[PDB]
């Protein structure tokens, strides 16, 4: 839209109030004209035709229980964009202020949300297994991170590489949840995964095995399904990535933590300046070790911790 940037206001999936950036012209559309070449959001209309119709509001106030996904799936994108900019110095996913489009209410009770290649997508959850996946910021960045991983590495979404793509998308998906310091945990989607059981999550990074995810490269799932096990064997890298930030004695291997804002810059550099489509775990090791060297010389604890943290989860 050609229009006048303002600020409206609306309510998340988990009902927080939050000023949003919206674009008046006739109506108020959910076009944050402030970051990048814009961050747009479209009503899918519980249907599949993408990206749907750009979101519009009449009074510029989004509190209706149909807007909760759009808004949460909007505020959270600009917080992510914020991150990648206000740390890593990256301008939207492409790197050159690409326009972050988003669709919400994509199909009936679709228990999922993804990067379609062009754009982030979001369901409303079935209402047993999920609530609107806009609702989690964890969820937004992961699926946005996927796009970064497109326009940097291009790690192909099967086998080890695939397990990496998601892992990154777990890794910066957390490092983004800690940016906003919004009940920040090393967990994946508790806030909007199963309302009927507060105190759980789809995945974990501190302990994946709790949700059927391996925490070593001895327990690496092979079979053709999950595209080799992308949404599974990730768990190895979740642990690795996690262990580094935090530290701990995994299968008897005394790692030493370096905080989450030294995990970022490493995975990011590796993500951006070291990885390939065809990047197995072992190379991820080389890539994280190397990064550390660039970022903190070899004889630093950083290179030493990465080596330790991959030495834990069975990667050489
Ligand atoms: Ca309204
Ligand atoms: Ca949380
Ligand atoms: Ca979380
Ligand atoms: Ca839950
Ligand atoms: Zn994903």
UniProtKB/Swiss-Prot annotation:
Lineage top rank: taxon: Bacteria
Entry keyword S-adenosyl-L-methionine: no
Cofactor(s) listed: Ca(2+); Zn(2+)
Localization in the cell: Secreted
Keyword field: Calcium, Hydrolase, Metal-binding, Metalloprotease, Protease, Secreted, Signal, Zinc, Zymogen
Thermal activity profile: Thermostable.
Primary enzyme class: hydrolase
Binding-site residues, Ca(2+) 2: 138, 177, 185, 187, 190
Predominant location: secreted
Reactions the enzyme catalyzes: Preferential cleavage: Xaa-|-Leu > Xaa-|-Phe
Residues engaged in binding Ca(2+) 4: 193-194, 197, 200
GO annotations of cellular component type: extracellular region
MF-aspect GO terms: metal ion binding; metalloendopeptidase activity
Residues that hold Ca(2+) 1 according to the record: 57, 59, 61
Binding site for Zn(2+): 142, 146, 166
Details of cofactor binding: Binds 4 Ca(2+) ions per subunit. Binds 1 zinc ion per subunit.
Active site: 143, 231
One BP term from GO: proteolysis
Residue sites binding Ca(2+) 3 per the record: 177, 183, 185, 190
This enzyme's EC code(s): 3.4.24.27
Cystine connections: none
Function comment: Extracellular zinc metalloprotease.
Family indicated by similarity: Belongs to the peptidase M4 family.
Protein name per its UniProtKB record: Thermolysin
Origin species: Bacillus thermoproteolyticus
Taxonomic path: Bacteria, Bacillati, Bacillota, Bacilli, Bacillales
Span covered, complete protein: 233 to 548 of 548
